PDB file of C-alpha atoms in Angstrom:
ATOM      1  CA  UNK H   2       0.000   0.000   0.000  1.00  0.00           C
ATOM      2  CA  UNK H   3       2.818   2.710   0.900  1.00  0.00           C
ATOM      3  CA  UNK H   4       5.090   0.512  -1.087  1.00  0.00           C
ATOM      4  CA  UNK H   5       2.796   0.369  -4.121  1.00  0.00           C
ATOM      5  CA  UNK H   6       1.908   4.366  -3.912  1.00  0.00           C
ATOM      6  CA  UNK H   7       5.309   5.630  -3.244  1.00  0.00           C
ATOM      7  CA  UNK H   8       5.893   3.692  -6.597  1.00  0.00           C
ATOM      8  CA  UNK H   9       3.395   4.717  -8.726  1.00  0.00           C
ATOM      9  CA  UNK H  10       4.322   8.436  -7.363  1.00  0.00           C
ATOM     10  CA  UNK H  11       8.063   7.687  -8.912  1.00  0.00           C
ATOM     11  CA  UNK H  12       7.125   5.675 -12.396  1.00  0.00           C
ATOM     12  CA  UNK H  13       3.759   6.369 -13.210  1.00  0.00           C
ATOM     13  CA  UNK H  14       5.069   8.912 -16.180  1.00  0.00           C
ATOM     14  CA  UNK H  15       7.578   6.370 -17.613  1.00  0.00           C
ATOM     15  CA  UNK H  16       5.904   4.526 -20.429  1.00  0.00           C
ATOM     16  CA  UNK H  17       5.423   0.939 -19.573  1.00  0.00           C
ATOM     17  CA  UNK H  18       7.471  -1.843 -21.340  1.00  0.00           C
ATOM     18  CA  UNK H  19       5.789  -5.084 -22.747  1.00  0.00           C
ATOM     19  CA  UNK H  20       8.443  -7.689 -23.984  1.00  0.00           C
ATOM     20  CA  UNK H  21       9.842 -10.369 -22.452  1.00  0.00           C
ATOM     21  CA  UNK H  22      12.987 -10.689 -24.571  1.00  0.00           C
ATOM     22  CA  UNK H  23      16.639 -10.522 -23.780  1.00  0.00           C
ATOM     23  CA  UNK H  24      19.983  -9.565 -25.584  1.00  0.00           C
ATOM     24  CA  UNK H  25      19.712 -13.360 -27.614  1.00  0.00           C
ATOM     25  CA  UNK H  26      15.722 -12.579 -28.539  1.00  0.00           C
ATOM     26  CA  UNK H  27      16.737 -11.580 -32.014  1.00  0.00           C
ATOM     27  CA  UNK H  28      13.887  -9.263 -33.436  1.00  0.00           C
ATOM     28  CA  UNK H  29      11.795  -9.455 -30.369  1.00  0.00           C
ATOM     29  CA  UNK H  30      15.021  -8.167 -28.178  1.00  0.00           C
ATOM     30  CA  UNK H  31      14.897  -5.051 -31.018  1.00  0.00           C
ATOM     31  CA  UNK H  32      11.458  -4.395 -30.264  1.00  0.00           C
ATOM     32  CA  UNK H  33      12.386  -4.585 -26.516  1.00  0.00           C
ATOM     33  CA  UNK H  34      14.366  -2.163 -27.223  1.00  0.00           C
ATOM     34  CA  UNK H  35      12.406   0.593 -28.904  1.00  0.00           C
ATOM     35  CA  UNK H  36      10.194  -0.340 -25.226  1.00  0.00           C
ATOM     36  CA  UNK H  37      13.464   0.534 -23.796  1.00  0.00           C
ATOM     37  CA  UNK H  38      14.282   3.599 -25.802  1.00  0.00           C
ATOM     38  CA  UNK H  39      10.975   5.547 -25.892  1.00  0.00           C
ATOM     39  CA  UNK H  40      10.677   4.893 -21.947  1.00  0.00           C
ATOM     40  CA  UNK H  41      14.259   6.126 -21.004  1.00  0.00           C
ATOM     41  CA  UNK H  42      13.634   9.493 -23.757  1.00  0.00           C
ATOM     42  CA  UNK H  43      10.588  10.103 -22.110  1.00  0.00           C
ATOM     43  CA  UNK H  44      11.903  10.099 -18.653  1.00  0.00           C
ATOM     44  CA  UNK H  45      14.694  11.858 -19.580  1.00  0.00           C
ATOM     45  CA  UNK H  46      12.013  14.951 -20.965  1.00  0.00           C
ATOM     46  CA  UNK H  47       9.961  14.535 -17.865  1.00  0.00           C
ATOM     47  CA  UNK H  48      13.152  14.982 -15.756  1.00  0.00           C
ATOM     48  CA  UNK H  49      14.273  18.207 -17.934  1.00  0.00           C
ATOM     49  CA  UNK H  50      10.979  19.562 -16.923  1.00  0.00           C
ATOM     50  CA  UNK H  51      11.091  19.241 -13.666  1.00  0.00           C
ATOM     51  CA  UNK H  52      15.004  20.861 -13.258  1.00  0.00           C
ATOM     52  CA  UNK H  53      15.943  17.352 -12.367  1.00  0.00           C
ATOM     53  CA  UNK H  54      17.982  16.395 -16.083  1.00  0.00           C
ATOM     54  CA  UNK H  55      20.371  13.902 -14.012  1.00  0.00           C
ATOM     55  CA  UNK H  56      21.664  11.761 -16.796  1.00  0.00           C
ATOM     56  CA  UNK H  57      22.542  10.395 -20.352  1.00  0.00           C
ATOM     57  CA  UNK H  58      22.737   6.601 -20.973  1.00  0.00           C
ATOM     58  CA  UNK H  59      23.835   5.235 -24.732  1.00  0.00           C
ATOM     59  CA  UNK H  60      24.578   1.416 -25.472  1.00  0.00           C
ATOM     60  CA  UNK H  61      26.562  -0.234 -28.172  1.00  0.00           C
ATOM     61  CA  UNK H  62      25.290  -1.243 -31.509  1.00  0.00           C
ATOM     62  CA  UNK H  63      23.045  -4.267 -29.747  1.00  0.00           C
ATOM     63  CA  UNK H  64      21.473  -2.762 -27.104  1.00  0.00           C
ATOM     64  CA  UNK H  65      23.692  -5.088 -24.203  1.00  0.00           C
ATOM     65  CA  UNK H  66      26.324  -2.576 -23.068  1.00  0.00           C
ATOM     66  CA  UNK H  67      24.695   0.695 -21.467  1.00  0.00           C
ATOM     67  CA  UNK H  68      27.294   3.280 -20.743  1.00  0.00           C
ATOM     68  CA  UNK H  69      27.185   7.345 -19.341  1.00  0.00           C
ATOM     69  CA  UNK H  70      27.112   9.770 -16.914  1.00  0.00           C
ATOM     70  CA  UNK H  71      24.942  10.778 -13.883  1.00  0.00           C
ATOM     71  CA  UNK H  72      24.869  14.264 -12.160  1.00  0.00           C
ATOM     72  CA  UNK H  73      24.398  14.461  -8.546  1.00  0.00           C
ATOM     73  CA  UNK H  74      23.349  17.772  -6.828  1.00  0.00           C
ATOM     74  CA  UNK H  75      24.701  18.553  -2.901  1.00  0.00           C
ATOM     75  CA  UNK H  76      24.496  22.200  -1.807  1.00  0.00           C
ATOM     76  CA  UNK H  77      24.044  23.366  -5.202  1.00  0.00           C
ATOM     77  CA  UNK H  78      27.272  21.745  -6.161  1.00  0.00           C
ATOM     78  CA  UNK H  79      26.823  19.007  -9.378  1.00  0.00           C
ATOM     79  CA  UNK H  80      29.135  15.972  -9.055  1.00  0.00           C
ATOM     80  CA  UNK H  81      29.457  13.635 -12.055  1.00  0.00           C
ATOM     81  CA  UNK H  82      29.898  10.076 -12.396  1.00  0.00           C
ATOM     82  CA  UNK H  83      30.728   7.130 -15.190  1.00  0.00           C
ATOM     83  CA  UNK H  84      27.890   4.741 -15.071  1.00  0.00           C
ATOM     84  CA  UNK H  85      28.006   1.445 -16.729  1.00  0.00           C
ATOM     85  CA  UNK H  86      25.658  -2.113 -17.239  1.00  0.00           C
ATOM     86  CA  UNK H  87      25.549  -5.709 -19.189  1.00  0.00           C
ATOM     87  CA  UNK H  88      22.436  -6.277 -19.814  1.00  0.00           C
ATOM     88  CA  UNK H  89      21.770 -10.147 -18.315  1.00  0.00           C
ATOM     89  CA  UNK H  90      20.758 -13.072 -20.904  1.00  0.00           C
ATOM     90  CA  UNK H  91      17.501 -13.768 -18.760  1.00  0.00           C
ATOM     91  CA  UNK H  92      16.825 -10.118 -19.378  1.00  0.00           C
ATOM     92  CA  UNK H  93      14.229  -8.340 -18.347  1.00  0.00           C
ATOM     93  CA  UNK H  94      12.980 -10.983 -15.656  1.00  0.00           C
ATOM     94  CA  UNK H  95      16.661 -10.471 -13.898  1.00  0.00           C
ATOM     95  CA  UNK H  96      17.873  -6.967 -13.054  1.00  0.00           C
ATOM     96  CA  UNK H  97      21.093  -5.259 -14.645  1.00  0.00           C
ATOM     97  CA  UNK H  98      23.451  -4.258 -12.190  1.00  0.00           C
ATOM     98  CA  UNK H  99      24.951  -0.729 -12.142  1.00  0.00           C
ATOM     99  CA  UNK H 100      28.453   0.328 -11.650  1.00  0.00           C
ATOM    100  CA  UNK H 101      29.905   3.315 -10.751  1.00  0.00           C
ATOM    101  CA  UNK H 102      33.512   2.154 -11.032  1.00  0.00           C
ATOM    102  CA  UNK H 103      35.214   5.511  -9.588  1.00  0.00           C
ATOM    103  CA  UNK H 104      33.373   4.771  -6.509  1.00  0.00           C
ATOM    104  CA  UNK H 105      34.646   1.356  -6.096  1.00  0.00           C
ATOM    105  CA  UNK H 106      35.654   0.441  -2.447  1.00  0.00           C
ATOM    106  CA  UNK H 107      34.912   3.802  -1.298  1.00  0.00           C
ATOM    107  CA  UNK H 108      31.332   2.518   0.227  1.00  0.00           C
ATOM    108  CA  UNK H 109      30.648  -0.261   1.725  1.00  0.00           C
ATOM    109  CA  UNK H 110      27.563  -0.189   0.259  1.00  0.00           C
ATOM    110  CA  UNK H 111      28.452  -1.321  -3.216  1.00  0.00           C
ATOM    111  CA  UNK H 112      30.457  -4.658  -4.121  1.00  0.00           C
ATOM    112  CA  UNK H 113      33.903  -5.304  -5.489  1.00  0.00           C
ATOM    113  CA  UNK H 114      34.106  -3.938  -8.630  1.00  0.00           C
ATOM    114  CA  UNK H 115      32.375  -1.135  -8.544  1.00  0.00           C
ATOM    115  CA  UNK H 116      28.276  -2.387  -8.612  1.00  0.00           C
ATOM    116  CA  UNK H 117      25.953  -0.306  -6.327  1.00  0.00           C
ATOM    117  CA  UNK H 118      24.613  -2.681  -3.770  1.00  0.00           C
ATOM    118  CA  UNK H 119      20.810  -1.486  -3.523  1.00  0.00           C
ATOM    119  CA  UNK H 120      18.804  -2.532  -0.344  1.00  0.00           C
ATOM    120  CA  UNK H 121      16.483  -5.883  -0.190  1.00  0.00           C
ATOM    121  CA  UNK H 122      13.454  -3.741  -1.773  1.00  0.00           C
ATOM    122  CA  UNK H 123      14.240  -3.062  -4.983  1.00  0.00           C
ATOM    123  CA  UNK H 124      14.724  -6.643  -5.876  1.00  0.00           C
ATOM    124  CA  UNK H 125      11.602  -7.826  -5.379  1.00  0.00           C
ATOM    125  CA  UNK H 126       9.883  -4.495  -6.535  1.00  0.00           C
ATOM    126  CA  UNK H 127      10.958  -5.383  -9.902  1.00  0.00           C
ATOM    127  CA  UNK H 128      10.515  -8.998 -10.181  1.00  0.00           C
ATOM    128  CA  UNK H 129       6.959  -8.222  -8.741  1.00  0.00           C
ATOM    129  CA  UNK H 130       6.516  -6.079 -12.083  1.00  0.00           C
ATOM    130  CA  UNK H 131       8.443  -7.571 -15.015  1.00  0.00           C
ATOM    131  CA  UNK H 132       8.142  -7.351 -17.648  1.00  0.00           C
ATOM    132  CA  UNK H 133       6.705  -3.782 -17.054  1.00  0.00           C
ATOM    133  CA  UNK H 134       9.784  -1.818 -15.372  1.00  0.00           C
ATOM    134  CA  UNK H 135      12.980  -1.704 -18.310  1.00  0.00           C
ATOM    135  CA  UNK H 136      16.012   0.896 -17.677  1.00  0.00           C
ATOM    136  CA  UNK H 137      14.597   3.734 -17.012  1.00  0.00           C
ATOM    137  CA  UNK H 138      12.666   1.971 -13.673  1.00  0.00           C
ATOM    138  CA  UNK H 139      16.321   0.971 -12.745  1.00  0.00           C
ATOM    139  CA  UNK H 140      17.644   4.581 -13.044  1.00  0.00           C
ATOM    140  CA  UNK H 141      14.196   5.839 -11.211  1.00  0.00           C
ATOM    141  CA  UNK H 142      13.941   3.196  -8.732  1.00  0.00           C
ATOM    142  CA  UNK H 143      17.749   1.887  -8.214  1.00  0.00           C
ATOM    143  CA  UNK H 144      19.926   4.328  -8.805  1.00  0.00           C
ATOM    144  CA  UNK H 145      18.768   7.431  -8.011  1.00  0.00           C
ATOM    145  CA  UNK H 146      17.915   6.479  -4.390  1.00  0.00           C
ATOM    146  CA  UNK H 147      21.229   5.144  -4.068  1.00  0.00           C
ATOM    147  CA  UNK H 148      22.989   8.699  -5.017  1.00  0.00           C
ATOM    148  CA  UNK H 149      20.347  10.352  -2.644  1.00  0.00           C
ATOM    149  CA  UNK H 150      21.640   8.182   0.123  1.00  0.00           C
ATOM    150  CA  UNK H 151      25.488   7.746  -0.950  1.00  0.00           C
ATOM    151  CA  UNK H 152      26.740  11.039  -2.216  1.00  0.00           C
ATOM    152  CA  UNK H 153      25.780  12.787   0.628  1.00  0.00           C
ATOM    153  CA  UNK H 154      27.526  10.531   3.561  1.00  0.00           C
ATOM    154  CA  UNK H 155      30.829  10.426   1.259  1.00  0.00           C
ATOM    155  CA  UNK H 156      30.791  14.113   0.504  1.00  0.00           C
ATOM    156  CA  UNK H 157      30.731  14.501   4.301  1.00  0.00           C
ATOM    157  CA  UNK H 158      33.118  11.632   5.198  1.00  0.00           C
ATOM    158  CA  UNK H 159      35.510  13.809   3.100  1.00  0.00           C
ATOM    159  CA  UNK H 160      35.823  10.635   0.543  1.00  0.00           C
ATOM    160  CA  UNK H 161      34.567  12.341  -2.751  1.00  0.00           C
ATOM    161  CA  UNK H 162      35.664  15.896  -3.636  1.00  0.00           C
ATOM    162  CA  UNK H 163      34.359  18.854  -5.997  1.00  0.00           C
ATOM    163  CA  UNK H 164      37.227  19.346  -8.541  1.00  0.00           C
ATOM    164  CA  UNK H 165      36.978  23.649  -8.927  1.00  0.00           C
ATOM    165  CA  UNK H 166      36.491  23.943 -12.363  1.00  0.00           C
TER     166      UNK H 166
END
């Protein structure tokens, strides 16, 4: 109930995705990912309009190696990271798993290597609505609690800096 509406307050302006297909689904993994395409666009307009623009995300040629940046605001100071994710085979049943390599072993809430470790909720919040959550969910839902959390702690534990530029 507080679960399901704090969701729907997050994702409910994300188109919805519809195909169960995976990076080995040959043309029903492309149309997975136009799903995956027109959601992440769309989230990324919604975001512009609401002052909160706080990434870009492009893949290789078949749609199984994501790749960018993220922006994270603290006291009106924007820090930027290099994200990356595989895709997984069993796709979009199983969650990708994000890394933020230039944070690796600088919190111990994120695993060697550099993948965020998110807490025991998101897990089953998206296996309770595959095939309907795709990458912009995980960027909505994952990530971007994570950085609300993370950023701020390390900021203060002195462990990331603001290069003056």
């Amino acid at each position: 109930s507080m679960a399901d509406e704090a969701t729907r307050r997050v994702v409910s302006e994300i188109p919805v995705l519809k195909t169960n297909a995976g990076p080995r689904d040959r043309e029903l993994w492309v149309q997975r990912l136009k799903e995956e395409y027109q959601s992440l666009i769309r989230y990324v307009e919604n975001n512009k309009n609401a002052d909160n623009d706080w990434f870009r995300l492009e893949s290789n040629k078949e749609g199984t190696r994501w790749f960018g940046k993220c922006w994270y605001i603290h006291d009106l100071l924007k820090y930027e990271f290099d994200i990356e994710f595989d895709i997984p085979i069993t796709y979009p049943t199983t969650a990708p798993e994000i890394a933020v390599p230039e944070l690796d072993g600088k919190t111990a809430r994120m695993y060697r290597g550099g993948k965020i470790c998110l807490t025991d909720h998101f897990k089953p919040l998206w296996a309770r609505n595959v095939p309907k959550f795709g990458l912009a969910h995980l960027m909505a839902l994952g990530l971007g609690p994570w950085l609300a959390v993370e950023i701020p702690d390390l900021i203060q534990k002195g462990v990331i800096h603001h290069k003056e530029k």
